[PDB]
Amino acid sequence: STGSATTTPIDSLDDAYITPVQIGTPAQTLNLDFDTGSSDLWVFSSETTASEVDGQTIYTPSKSTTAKLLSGATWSISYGDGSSSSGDVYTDTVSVGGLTVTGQAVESAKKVSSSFTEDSTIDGLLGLAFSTLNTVSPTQQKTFFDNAKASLDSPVFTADLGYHAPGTYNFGFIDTTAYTGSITYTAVSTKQGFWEWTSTGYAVGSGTFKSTSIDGIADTGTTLLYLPATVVSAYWAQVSGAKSSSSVGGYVFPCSATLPSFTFGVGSARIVIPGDYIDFGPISTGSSSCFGGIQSSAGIGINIFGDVALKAAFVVFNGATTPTLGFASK
């Protein structure tokens, strides 16, 4: 089997991407944030505290003839941005782009933190990291990809995120028309539950490539590119007037600037992030200070190849017995 679904930016900045997902019988379609940095499929629901729902579409398990309470199971998750959610668990039929999994754990939110409430465009998350990170207790549950893998034509999914435009998540096949050149594959460590890999270095604009190992995670659920402070300083030093602002919470730059590109290495290959992809717009409405899309990871504990980086590539998440990651230009 295969599946193919379009993923759409939630706003004009590409702050996140939503993909429609069918849950239950008859189908209830929710727009979920596919997140290769976590491993829970959770949704706003009829069980979510009413004051914490503000415009989201909810899953109502009582209206699904295939929903079953997973007795005794609870979940609770906290994300790197400080947001969180928790609740109980149903199993139900879940389909993405024509690919169907029966018996998928659908984690129903009883509580969500304010940032989820305040984002009316995201109805939940669909985790695509390794199932060892799944938070369901006392019986850990598998991701949608883990459940589908055996049925897929090939045990892979691909992320093709657009810049200011829709893109595609495919399951079970590699669309050879969706990228240019060849796909360069690189090793993955699953020891932390992430799609963790080592970039071979970077360049800023037309500058020379610096060969240096940068361990980080391919995370579709993180908006920006978080890299070591040395790398980030070298980037922003090429932008007149750019500075790190403690009050804003990262590097800002004059909105009048033209930003240089940023290149990262994948083995001997190179992925070029155009400068425009690094512009996240005014820090507050009407400001002439703009927020940068490359930020320091120094306070995180891990480097994160988020959407800013991944949207410059066609990315293969290869879930073979030994997982690997593939990157191609597009």
Q: Which residues are catalytically annotated?
A: 35, 199
With contact defined as beta carbons under 8 Å apart, do 148 and 128 qualify? no
Nearest-angstrom CA–CA distance, 178 and 99? 20
Strands 156-160, 250-254: pairing is: unpaired
Query: Which amino acid, 8?
Result: T
- List, in order, residues 6 or more apart from 170 with CB less than 8 Å away: 2, 3, 4, 97, 157, 158, 160
Query: Which amino acid, 212?
Result: T
Phi-psi region of 148 (alpha: psi -120 to 50; beta: other; left: phi over 0): alpha
The upper half-sphere exposure of residue 219, i.e. CA atoms within 13 Å in the direction of its Cβ, equals 22
Strands 210-218, 303-305: pairing is: parallel
Given the structure tokens 């240089």, which residue do they identify?
260
